Amino acid sequence: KNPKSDKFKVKRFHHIEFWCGDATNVARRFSWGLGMRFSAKSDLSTGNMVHASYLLTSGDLRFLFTAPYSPSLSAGEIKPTTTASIPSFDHGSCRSFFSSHGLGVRAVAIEVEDAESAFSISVANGAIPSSPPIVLNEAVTIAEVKLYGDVVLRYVSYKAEEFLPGFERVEDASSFPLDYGIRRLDHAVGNVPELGPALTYVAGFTGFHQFAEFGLNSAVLASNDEMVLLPINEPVHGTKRKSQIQTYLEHNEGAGLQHLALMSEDIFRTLREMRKRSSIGGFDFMPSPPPTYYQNLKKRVGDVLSDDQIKECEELGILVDRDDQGTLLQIFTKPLGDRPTIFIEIIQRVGCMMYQSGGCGGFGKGNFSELFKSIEEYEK
Amino acid sequence: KNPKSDKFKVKRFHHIEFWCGDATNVARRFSWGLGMRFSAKSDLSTGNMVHASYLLTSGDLRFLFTAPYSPSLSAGEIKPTTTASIPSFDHGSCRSFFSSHGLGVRAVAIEVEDAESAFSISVANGAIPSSPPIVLNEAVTIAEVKLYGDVVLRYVSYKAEFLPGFERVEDASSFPLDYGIRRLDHAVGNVPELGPALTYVAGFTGFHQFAEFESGLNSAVLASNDEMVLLPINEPVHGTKRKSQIQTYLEHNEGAGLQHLALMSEDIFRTLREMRKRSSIGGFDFMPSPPPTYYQNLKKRVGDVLSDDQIKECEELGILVDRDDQGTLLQIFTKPLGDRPTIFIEIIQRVGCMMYQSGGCGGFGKGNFSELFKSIEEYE
Ligand SMILES: N[C@@H](Cc1ccccc1)C(=O)O
Ligand SMILES: [Co+2]
Ligand SMILES: [Co+2]
Known part of the structure; x- marks a missing residue:
C-alpha cells in the first residue's frame, strides 16, 4: 500500500x-x-x-x-x-x-x-x-x-x-569507454544505531513511505513512484555471531552509508567482467554460497531461470531471491577500501513490467533463510 | 672522484x-x-x-x-x-x-x-x-x-x-603482474634551499656529491660508497620567465618533500608499452611527448648506441635519451601520481658502465634541458 x-x-x-x-x-x-x-x-x-x-x-x-x-x-x-x-x-x-x-x-x-x-x-x-x-x-x-x-x-x-x-x-x-553492464543506482542503504528515530526523521521531512516486502532489523523508505529507495539497518545485539551492522558502526565511527546497489542490464556480463579484474586492481567478491544453495534454487526459481542460467549463477557466485511480483539476482563485493564498512551490491531485477516498477523482487530478505539452510545441507 | x-x-x-x-x-x-x-x-x-x-x-x-x-x-x-x-x-x-x-x-x-x-x-x-x-x-x-x-x-x-x-x-x-620494473634507482626531493639541505644530509650520512658532466632549478646528488643509494635534491631558481616547477611543487605540497621516484626497468620499451596501454583504464599518464625533431636530432648523439629501429621506438613511446661520458640514459616521466602537481614517477634504463653496472651510469638527464629547448625551437 x-x-x-x-x-x-x-x-x-x-x-x-x-x-x-x-x-x-x-x-x-x-x-x-x-x-x-x-x-x-x-x-x-x-x-x-x-x-x-x-x-x-x-x-x-x-x-x-x-x-x-x-x-x-x-x-x-x-x-x-x-x-x-x-x-x-x-x-x-x-x-x-x-x-x-x-x-x-x-x-x-x-x-x-x-x-x-x-x-x-x-x-x-x-x-x-x-x-x-x-x-x-x-x-x-x-x-x-x-x-x-x-x-x-x-x-x-x-x-x-x-x-x-x-x-x-x-x-x-x-575517456576510455569502459562498460560492464552497470546502468543505474537502484538503492542506497544506511546503517544507524537505532532504526525507529532514523526512520521517523527521514520519513518526517521527505514524506517517503515504507516499502513492504514478503542479525539486524531494517525498513525501506521510498518515494512516490518507488524509484528512490533508501533502506536503513540497525543492529540486533545479543546474537551468537556479532552483528555486522554493529561492526560497521564501530569501524565507521557511527552511522553512515553501508552499501550502494547498482543495477546491471546483464548481471552475468557484469560479474564476469568485474571478476576478471578482481586481482588486477578491481573489486573482490564475498565468498560464494555452497553448491547446496544452487541445487535448491531449482525448486525456487526454476520457473524463472533455465538450468543453464542457474549453473551460470553458480559460476559467478550470484544469489537469487523472489518476491510475489518479481525475482532478484544479487551479489555483494568485499569492502571498497581499508575498513569493513562500505561495499557495493550488483543486482538485476526480473518481473513487474508496467518500464519496470521499483523494488521488483525486494531486497534479498529471503536469502538469510536460504543461506543458513544451504550451509546446513553442505555440511551434511 | x-x-x-x-x-x-x-x-x-x-x-x-x-x-x-x-x-x-x-x-x-x-x-x-x-x-x-x-x-x-x-x-x-x-x-x-x-x-x-x-x-x-x-x-x-x-x-x-x-x-x-x-x-x-x-x-x-x-x-x-x-x-x-x-x-x-x-x-x-x-x-x-x-x-x-x-x-x-x-x-x-x-x-x-x-x-x-x-x-x-x-x-x-x-x-x-x-x-x-x-x-x-x-x-x-x-x-x-x-x-x-x-x-x-x-x-x-x-x-x-x-x-x-x-x-x-x-x-x-596475488596476480603476478610484471611490466619489467626491477628496482629503485634514485629518489629526488625538493627543498626551498639546496645548500643547507645538502649540508645536513651529507653531514649525518657521509654521502658524497655524485659528479655530473638557466631554466628551472639547481640540484645536486648525494651518493653512498658504491653509489647505489642515490638521492638528488632540488631547489627552485626564482625570477625566471616561466614559473619554477620546484617552486610550484613546494606551494602545492606545503613545503619540502619527495618529488619523484626513478624506477629501473630491465626493458624500458616493454615497460612503456605496458604502462601506456593502461593510462586510460586505471593507470598512469605520461608527460607530453617531445617534438619529432628531438628524435631527428637523436642520431647525431646516440646513433652510436641505438639503432634507427631503437630510435623509432623511442619516439612512439615518448622516451627521452641522454648521455654523459660513461654511459647512456633512457628516461620518461609520468604525470603526477595523484590530485596535486607534486610527486610523479620516472621510468629509466641505463646503458653502459659495466665492469655489474655502476650506479648513476649516464647521469640523470640534465642534458635533456638543453635538448628540449632546442627541439622545441626547431619544430617551430
Ligand atoms: N633535477 C632532479 C629532478 C627533477 C627532474 C625533473 C624535473 C625537475 C626535477 C634530477 O637530478 O633529476
Ligand atoms: Co540491498
Ligand atoms: Co631523475
Whole structure:
C-alpha cells in the first residue's frame, strides 16, 4: 500500500559523492574495477583551487570523487569569490569526514523539481539543514540536509531540460569507454544505531513511505513512484555471531552509508567482467554460497531461470531471491577500501513490467533463510 | 672522484612507503598501473588494529602503502602492547602528513648493516631523530631520522616476509603482474634551499656529491660508497620567465618533500608499452611527448648506441635519451601520481658502465634541458 505522500516532487537518483583523501587514485581504481567512464572534472585544470572532483558514469549511474587541496591555494577567496564548483564543500568538513570514517559516501543526491522548495519544506518538516540552496550560474540549484551520520541527502534541480556548472567534459584521450553492464543506482542503504528515530526523521521531512516486502532489523523508505529507495539497518545485539551492522558502526565511527546497489542490464556480463579484474586492481567478491544453495534454487526459481542460467549463477557466485511480483539476482563485493564498512551490491531485477516498477523482487530478505539452510545441507 | 666517506655501512634501497588516506585504493591503482604484485599485508586480518599496510613488489622494487584506521580500535593499547607492525607509525603524524601534503612518500628506506649504529652515528652527526631503533621480533631493527620536510630516511637491518607481522598475500589474491620494473634507482626531493639541505644530509650520512658532466632549478646528488643509494635534491631558481616547477611543487605540497621516484626497468620499451596501454583504464599518464625533431636530432648523439629501429621506438613511446661520458640514459616521466602537481614517477634504463653496472651510469638527464629547448625551437 503506497500512500504517495512525498512532500515535494522527487524524480530519480542523480549521483553519489565519495569524500576521499586522493580523488584521482580512488576514481581510477573504481573506473577499472566497475567499468565506468571518466566523464567530467573540476580541479586545478578547470580553475578550481579548492577541491578536486572527478565524475565517473555508467549508464545513468554517476559516481563523484572529491578531495580537498591545500587550503593555502584558496586562502584569499571568500564564499562570494569561491572557485569551488560545489559550493557546499568545506576543507575542514571534508578532512573531518575522511579521518573519522575513511573512504565513504558523503552525499546521496536525488534530482527534484525545485531544490530550493525541497530544502524549505524539508527543514520545515524537521530536516536538519546542511547547506542552504545555492543557484549555480542561474542553471542548477543544489541544497543539502542531513540524512544520517555525516551523510547528507542532496537536492539538485535544473531549470533547463553538463553535470554541474564549472565541471568540464574530459578529453576523449582520457575517456576510455569502459562498460560492464552497470546502468543505474537502484538503492542506497544506511546503517544507524537505532532504526525507529532514523526512520521517523527521514520519513518526517521527505514524506517517503515504507516499502513492504514478503542479525539486524531494517525498513525501506521510498518515494512516490518507488524509484528512490533508501533502506536503513540497525543492529540486533545479543546474537551468537556479532552483528555486522554493529561492526560497521564501530569501524565507521557511527552511522553512515553501508552499501550502494547498482543495477546491471546483464548481471552475468557484469560479474564476469568485474571478476576478471578482481586481482588486477578491481573489486573482490564475498565468498560464494555452497553448491547446496544452487541445487535448491531449482525448486525456487526454476520457473524463472533455465538450468543453464542457474549453473551460470553458480559460476559467478550470484544469489537469487523472489518476491510475489518479481525475482532478484544479487551479489555483494568485499569492502571498497581499508575498513569493513562500505561495499557495493550488483543486482538485476526480473518481473513487474508496467518500464519496470521499483523494488521488483525486494531486497534479498529471503536469502538469510536460504543461506543458513544451504550451509546446513553442505555440511551434511 | 669518490672519497667513500659513508659513516656507516649502507647496502641498497629497501622500500618506499606512501602515507595514504585509503591504502587499498592507492595500492590497487599502483598495482595495475605499474605492473606490481601484491606480496604482503599487515591489517585487521593479521591482527593489526592500528594501520593498514599493503606491499607491492616488482623485482627488487618495494612500494609500501599505509593508512590509519580509527584510533578507537586501538585505544586500549600502549606502545609496549601495540599491534602496529611498524612501531614508528602514529595516527596523528599520519593524518597530519596526508592533510598537509596529500598523497606522498613518508619514508625512503635503505637497508644497512646495523640500523641501531646507523641511527646512533647519524644523530651523533646532526641527524634529527624521528623514531629510535626498535628491534622487531628479535630479527629486524628499524630506525628513522628526518630527511627533508616531513620525509624520513628509514634504516632497516636484518640479523639473518617483508617485516615481522606482515603476512604473505594469498596467491589467489596475488596476480603476478610484471611490466619489467626491477628496482629503485634514485629518489629526488625538493627543498626551498639546496645548500643547507645538502649540508645536513651529507653531514649525518657521509654521502658524497655524485659528479655530473638557466631554466628551472639547481640540484645536486648525494651518493653512498658504491653509489647505489642515490638521492638528488632540488631547489627552485626564482625570477625566471616561466614559473619554477620546484617552486610550484613546494606551494602545492606545503613545503619540502619527495618529488619523484626513478624506477629501473630491465626493458624500458616493454615497460612503456605496458604502462601506456593502461593510462586510460586505471593507470598512469605520461608527460607530453617531445617534438619529432628531438628524435631527428637523436642520431647525431646516440646513433652510436641505438639503432634507427631503437630510435623509432623511442619516439612512439615518448622516451627521452641522454648521455654523459660513461654511459647512456633512457628516461620518461609520468604525470603526477595523484590530485596535486607534486610527486610523479620516472621510468629509466641505463646503458653502459659495466665492469655489474655502476650506479648513476649516464647521469640523470640534465642534458635533456638543453635538448628540449632546442627541439622545441626547431619544430617551430
Ligand atoms: N633535477 C632532479 C629532478 C627533477 C627532474 C625533473 C624535473 C625537475 C626535477 C634530477 O637530478 O633529476
Ligand atoms: Co540491498
Ligand atoms: Co631523475
